[PDB]
Design an enzyme around this catalytic site. Sequence first.
Site, PDB file in Angstrom:
ATOM      1  CG  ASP A 262     -32.489  -2.289  25.922  1.00  0.00           C
ATOM      2  OD1 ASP A 262     -33.271  -1.523  25.321  1.00  0.00           O
ATOM      3  OD2 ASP A 262     -32.790  -2.771  27.032  1.00  0.00           O
ATOM      4  CD  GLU A 295     -32.704   2.728  25.134  1.00  0.00           C
ATOM      5  OE1 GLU A 295     -33.902   3.090  25.041  1.00  0.00           O
ATOM      6  OE2 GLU A 295     -32.373   1.791  25.867  1.00  0.00           O
TER       7      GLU A 295
END
Length: 589
Positions: A262, A295
């Site tokens: 993330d 990401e």
Amino acid sequence: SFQTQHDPRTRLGATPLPGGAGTRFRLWTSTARTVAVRVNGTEHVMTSLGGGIYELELPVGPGARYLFVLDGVPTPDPYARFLPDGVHGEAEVVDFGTFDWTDADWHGIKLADCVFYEVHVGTFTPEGTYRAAAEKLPYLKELGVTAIQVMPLAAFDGQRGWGYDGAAFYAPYAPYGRPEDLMALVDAAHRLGLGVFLDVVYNHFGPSGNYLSSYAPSYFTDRFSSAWGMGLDYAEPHMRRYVTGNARMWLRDYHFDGLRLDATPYMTDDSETHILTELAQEIHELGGTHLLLAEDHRNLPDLVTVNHLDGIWTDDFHHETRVTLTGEQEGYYAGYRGGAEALAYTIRRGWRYEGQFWAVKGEEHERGHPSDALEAPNFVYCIQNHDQIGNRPLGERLHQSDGVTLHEYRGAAALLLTLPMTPLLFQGQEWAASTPFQFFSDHAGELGQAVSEGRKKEFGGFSGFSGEDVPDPQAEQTFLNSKLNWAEREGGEHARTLRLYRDLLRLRREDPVLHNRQRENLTTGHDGDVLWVRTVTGAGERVLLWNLGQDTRAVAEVKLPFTVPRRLLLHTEGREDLTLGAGEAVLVG
Ligand SMILES: OC[C@H]1O[C@H](O[C@H]2[C@H](O)[C@@H](O)[C@H](O)O[C@@H]2CO)[C@H](O)[C@@H](O)[C@@H]1O
Ligand SMILES: OC[C@H]1O[C@H](O[C@H]2[C@H](O)[C@@H](O)[C@H](O)O[C@@H]2CO)[C@H](O)[C@@H](O)[C@@H]1O
Ligand SMILES: OC[C@H]1O[C@H](O[C@H]2[C@H](O)[C@@H](O)[C@H](O)O[C@@H]2CO)[C@H](O)[C@@H](O)[C@@H]1O
Ligand SMILES: OC[C@H]1O[C@H](O[C@H]2[C@H](O)[C@@H](O)[C@H](O)O[C@@H]2CO)[C@H](O)[C@@H](O)[C@@H]1O
Ligand SMILES: OC[C@H]1O[C@H](O[C@H]2[C@H](O)[C@@H](O)[C@H](O)O[C@@H]2CO)[C@H](O)[C@@H](O)[C@@H]1O
Ligand SMILES: OC[C@H]1O[C@H](O[C@H]2[C@H](O)[C@@H](O)[C@H](O)O[C@@H]2CO)[C@H](O)[C@@H](O)[C@@H]1O
Ligand SMILES: OC[C@H]1O[C@H](O[C@H]2[C@H](O)[C@@H](O)[C@H](O)O[C@@H]2CO)[C@H](O)[C@@H](O)[C@@H]1O
Ligand SMILES: [Mg+2]
Ligand SMILES: [Mg+2]
């Protein structure tokens, strides 16, 4: 010659000892003057080893309950492997060697063979557990996806949440199941030949349940911060090892096949060897085929070419597609024109922003880097994911937004699933699910009361957040309204959409030309509002044509710089003739 920094002998937390001798407890503290472990209610002083390391061995086994006592204050273990009473409670000692796996001959999955299916365990089934999710695996196998992408599992406070408030990174969130229930899910996926990936959050800790600073404030730094918390100090080796040890646990001990990192732009690190590089070294040291994805919004190839990650979730494709279909221009959508010519360009370049000005208000800067080094599988593309549904004011799906038809939705699926880039689908996307995926949380006290205003501020560029119908993130109903309705896929247009997804995923698996994974073999263009995407290999030629207009277009009248193939392989509305109604697509060969 890379040697892991991890040795079971010195592992922080509670680790079972060989020969049934019990458990070794270890911690690091820079500030405590008295240090004890409280096990099943009894306090035992720990031994000081130097460097702030404390240790004790006791004849307790798996299932024993403990926390640490720092200057007389009972404090949860940040290295807890399970927190049955939540993030403020005692940890349980876990032994990873007792589970009976049946996947000894499973060898992982290559990125170029991944079609991801993003699962949120809490909403994926009525029960919202690993055990219930496992029963849907045959459905996913038959559907034709190849890798499950599981949203974060680190323990967070409250009884539901997306996962990005995780605070105890090594402890699977108790409401979803016990450690062995997660292992059973992964084992079942592998038995069916499906990969399993985990979303991990190494840029911040959630706002409740993170006790690391009680041990050593120097896990963190005020040098930088993210939108969600204080900076993790990757100049501190214990902080580096907190996350690399975590990555190794998920892959080795839970048999995951890869991790999705993330918000990698906020893993700030100025060390000679970047933490992302070291994460890759540490997971590679396990001697398997495990993958790492980032990401990352920066359009930075170095994540692959320097840090040795395997691929990047790249939103430019998603954004260009959504703007094409809706014309929306709020927030980051103002960065895109949309349309056939725009989509042809973004696909041709992998991502759009390669160093040009991002002209969005309050955000004006030169964004991105040349994409040339990256090959097709390095780009992870989607038309839906947790963020691109759930960060909308009402959490509506693409086919639910104003101005989008189911025909356009189906055309978009055909584009995504025939490109050589690595695709991801969000749970329920494949049947045009009727349910939203909204932001929900369940924090206590003032923190809970603050969530709704935090959301409105974070996404203030989206005017819908200042409306009156924004679902309360803290309300039970917001969580329940995001639950998948499995019944609905059996009928009507849900079933029609599902049949198309099955057909597309079959073609992707079987078609000898769509097997291409080289950008050298992929070209794109447009004629008016018709997009074309051409693949040419030694096996033959394919063209996808998508009519993004509101009129009808005959394939024969599309102006192309090559001769269009004649054989109709798939039409998104099942038509016999080579003609595209508004929003429709066809694959020819
Ligand atoms: O456990 C704290 C220490 O971790 C690393 O040390 C590793 C070493 O790199 C590795 O070659 C050896 O096999 O195991 C030890 C861990 O027991 C760091 O290099 C040390 O600085 C840490 O103190
Ligand atoms: O049970 C004790 C209380 O601890 C919490 O405070 C923690 C918080 O969870 C953590 O994320 C923050 O960074 O550190 C503080 C203090 O260590 C809350 O005060 C309550 O929820 C708990 O009852
Ligand atoms: O965590 C996924 C799987 O990891 C191991 O499999 C490795 C294996 O150790 C290595 O020799 C190999 O061929 O690469 C595979 C895949 O990464 C476990 O043996 C599997 O049971 C796990 O599912
Ligand atoms: O799909 C229809 C047309 O959509 C876009 O046109 C937008 C334009 O980009 C935007 O700046 C303006 O404010 O609204 C129009 C839509 O009315 C594409 O750019 C066109 O090429 C499409 O035909
Ligand atoms: O550099 C452009 C902007 O990039 C980020 O915005 C991302 C956002 O993080 C992501 O969730 C969304 O899907 O796409 C946008 C646009 O790339 C930063 O958050 C912005 O501050 C930057 O201006
Ligand atoms: O209460 C903690 C924070 O919750 C939200 O942040 C969400 C965000 O909306 C979602 O897109 C993201 O990626 O997960 C985070 C963390 O849960 C609020 O928007 C924040 O203001 C709060 O601090
Ligand atoms: O394995 C059978 C297929 O082999 C080739 O496909 C290649 C493709 O050309 C290449 O870009 C990609 O990176 O790897 C696949 C193999 O995994 C043939 O081109 C196909 O026709 C065959 O079906
Ligand atoms: Mg995100
Ligand atoms: Mg024309």
